[PDB]
Amino acid sequence: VVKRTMTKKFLEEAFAGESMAHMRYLIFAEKAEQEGFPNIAKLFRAIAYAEFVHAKNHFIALGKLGKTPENLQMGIEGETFEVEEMYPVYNKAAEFQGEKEAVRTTHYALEAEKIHAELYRKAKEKAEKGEDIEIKKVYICPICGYTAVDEAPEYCPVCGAPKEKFVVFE
């Protein structure tokens, strides 16, 4: 595990950089697919995977990956920070500055992170005891990220999207 202060900071910066490169490449892969460049999309998805490999390498070099219950706990703490501190403040500041699009994107994320924190707390209770959670499918709204387990609601309560738009993970 890396211990020296400057190298640790540089790897955390590189982790952030690789995560953001991965994410832009996923966003760009979807746009290329929509514009009629399916091979360009394939290249973006593939390079996105390479940047996952690089960020995973940095993250393990920093000592941050543990067993499932501990990884769930990191999930819980991050989701809790975004629900209680980060997104309420960023949403209030956007409203204060009149930036309606940011009001919306921060509202969307906040309502979903409330769900994520609760799901990871239910998961951790099972993983603590060596059990897997019993969920069969998870549905995700592709507009706002709203997350539902086992059945999709009739429409998304956060953005109003129809049940038919939800993405299924089975």
Q: How far apart are CB 28 and Fe ion at their closest, in Å? A: 12
Q: What is the CA radius of gyration of the chain?
A: 18
From the list its own copies, Fe ion, none, pick the one residue 159 interacts with, judged by a Cβ distance below 5 to 8 Å according to partner type: Fe ion
Q: How far apart are CB 100 and its own copies at their closest, in Å? A: 9
* Nearest alpha-carbon partner for 83 in 105, 104, 109, 101: 109
What are phi and psi for residue 109, nearest 5 degrees? -65, -40
Q: Which of residues 104-163 bind Fe ion (CB under 5 A)?
A: 109, 113, 116, 141, 143-144, 146, 156, 158-159, 161
**What tokens does 132 get?**
């897997």
| Residue 15 or 127 with smaller CB distance to Fe ion | 15
Q: Near Fe ion by CB under 5 A, which window of 12-20, 37-45, 92-100, 128-136?
A: 12-20
What are phi and psi for residue 37, nearest 5 degrees? -120, 75
**What tokens does 102 get?**
């940011």
Check residue 14 for interaction with its own copies (CB under 8 A): yes
Residue 131 annotated as part of some ligand binding site: no
